[PDB]
C-alpha cells in the first residue's frame, strides 16, 4: 500500500523505534494530527527590530 514509516517518540528504555501509517480516507481532513512538526522562529516576537542587535554590544550607542 501507500505505507509511510516514520520515527516514534523516545521511550522510557533508550540510551525498531518506528511506526507505519496509511491514510484510508480521501480527504486530508481525515488524517491524524501533525504532532511531529517541530519548527521554530521566536525572532518574530523576541527580536522584531530593523537593525540587528548583537548581544555582546550596547543596545544604544
Amino acid at each position: 500500500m501507500g505505507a509511510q514509516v516514520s520515527t516514534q517518540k523516545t521511550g522510557a528504555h533508550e540510551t525498531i523505534i518506528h511506526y507505519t501509517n496509511i491514510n484510508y480516507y480521501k480527504d486530508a481532513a481525515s488524517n491524524s494530527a501533525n504532532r511531529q512538526d517541530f519548527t521554530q522562529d521566536p525572532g518574530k516576537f523576541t527580536e522584531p527590530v530593523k537593525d540587528i542587535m548583537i548581544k555582546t554590544m550596547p543596545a544604544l550607542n
Binding site: 481532513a29 481525515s30 488524517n31 494530527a33 504532532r35 512538526d37 527580536e47 522584531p48 555582546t56
Partner: protein, 277 residues
C-alpha cells in the same frame, strides 16, 4: 529535532562586552543566557519542546457544548436539540483559542450522548436501545421545528445516526471559514455604519447543529444529554496575545469586570520561611 539549546562552558571575564546591559525601549527581548553572566559548565541538553507545539497544545478533544432533550411530549420540554455552533460557551477551550488572534485547521468532532429515565413511582419499562440523530445545518438550510419535521430527511445536510452502547460517534471536518483563517477577535462591526453586531458574532457563522431521538416515543419520560467535543488538527495560528485575565461573562462579546492583575501578599519583600529546624 525539537531539542533545546545546550549551555556552552564559560570561564572568567573582563572585557568591554556587555551582554547583560541592554535597552528594552527597542522592543527587543534580551537574548542572554547563563553562560553570558557567569561561569558555566558544558551541558548536553536533550530536553525537547515537542509538547509545546501549537499542534500538541490545541489537538485535544475539549467539550464545547451540552444540551438535554426529552423523549415524551409532556409539558414544555424540548424533544430535540438546537445549537448555533461556536466555542465561546466553554471557558476552558475558549481561553486557549483566544491565545491567538487567527486560526486555521481541520477538526475532529466527537459526541458523547447519554440517556436516563426520569424519577417516578411506577416507571417499569422495557425500551429497546435508543437511536439518536445529529444533523448539521449550514447557514441558510431549513431548520426543523419538531422531532418529526421534514428537515430530518437529511437529503444533503451531513447527519449521523448513532445507537446507545456503541462508541461515541465521530467525524472530521475541513477548514470551513470563508476567510483565509478563523478569527477569534474582530474589532469591527457587521454594518458599514459602524453598528449592529460587534465582534465575533459579527462575522463567524458555522451554522447550527440539531439532535433528537429517532425513536417514536417512550412509555415514561426519558431525557438525553449530548456533549459536543472539538479537537483541532493540522493547526496553524497567528498573532499571539495576552491570555484572558477577567472571567468570561458573555459568550457574544468580551465584556468583563475589573480584575486584579494577580494575587496579593504581605509586601514586595515577603518570602515565606520554609526552613525551620
Amino acid at each position: 529535532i525539537a531539542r533545546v539549546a545546550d549551555t556552552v562552558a564559560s570561564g572568567p571575564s573582563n572585557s568591554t562586552s556587555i551582554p547583560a546591559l541592554t535597552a528594552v525601549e527597542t522592543g527587543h527581548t534580551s537574548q542572554v543566557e547563563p553562560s553570558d553572566t557567569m561561569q558555566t559548565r558544558h551541558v548536553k541538553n536533550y530536553h525537547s519542546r515537542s509538547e509545546s507545539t501549537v499542534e500538541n497544545f490545541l489537538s485535544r478533544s475539549a467539550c464545547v457544548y451540552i444540551e438535554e432533550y426529552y423523549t415524551k411530549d409532556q409539558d414544555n420540554v424540548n424533544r430535540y436539540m438546537s445549537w448555533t455552533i461556536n466555542a465561546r460557551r466553554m471557558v476552558q477551550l475558549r481561553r486557549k483559542f483566544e491565545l491567538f488572534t487567527y486560526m486555521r485547521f481541520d477538526m475532529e468532532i466527537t459526541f458523547v450522548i447519554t440517556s436516563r429515565q426520569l424519577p417516578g413511582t411506577s416507571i417499569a419499562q422495557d425500551m429497546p436501545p435508543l437511536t439518536h440523530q445529529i444533523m448539521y445545518i449550514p447557514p441558510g438550510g431549513p431548520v426543523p421545528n419538531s422531532v418529526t419535521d421534514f428537515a430530518w430527511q437529511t437529503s444533503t445536510n451531513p447527519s449521523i445516526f448513532w445507537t446507545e452502547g456503541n462508541a461515541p460517534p465521530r467525524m472530521s471536518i475541513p477548514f470551513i471559514s470563508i476567510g483565509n483563517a478563523y478569527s477569534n477577535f474582530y474589532d469591527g462591526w457587521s454594518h458599514f455604519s459602524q453598528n449592529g453586531v460587534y465582534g465575533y458574532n459579527a462575522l463567524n457563522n458555522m451554522g447550527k447543529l440539531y439532535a433528537r431521538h429517532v425513536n417514536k416515543d417512550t412509555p415514561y419520560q426519558m431525557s438525553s444529554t449530548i456533549r459536543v467535543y472539538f479537537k483541532p488538527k493540522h493547526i496553524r495560528v497567528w498573532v499571539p496575545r495576552p491570555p484572558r485575565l477577567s472571567p468570561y461573562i458573555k459568550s457574544s462579546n468580551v465584556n468583563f469586570n475589573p480584575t486584579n492583575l494577580t494575587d496579593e501578599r504581605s509586601s514586595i519583600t515577603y518570602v515565606p520561611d520554609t526552613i525551620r529546624p
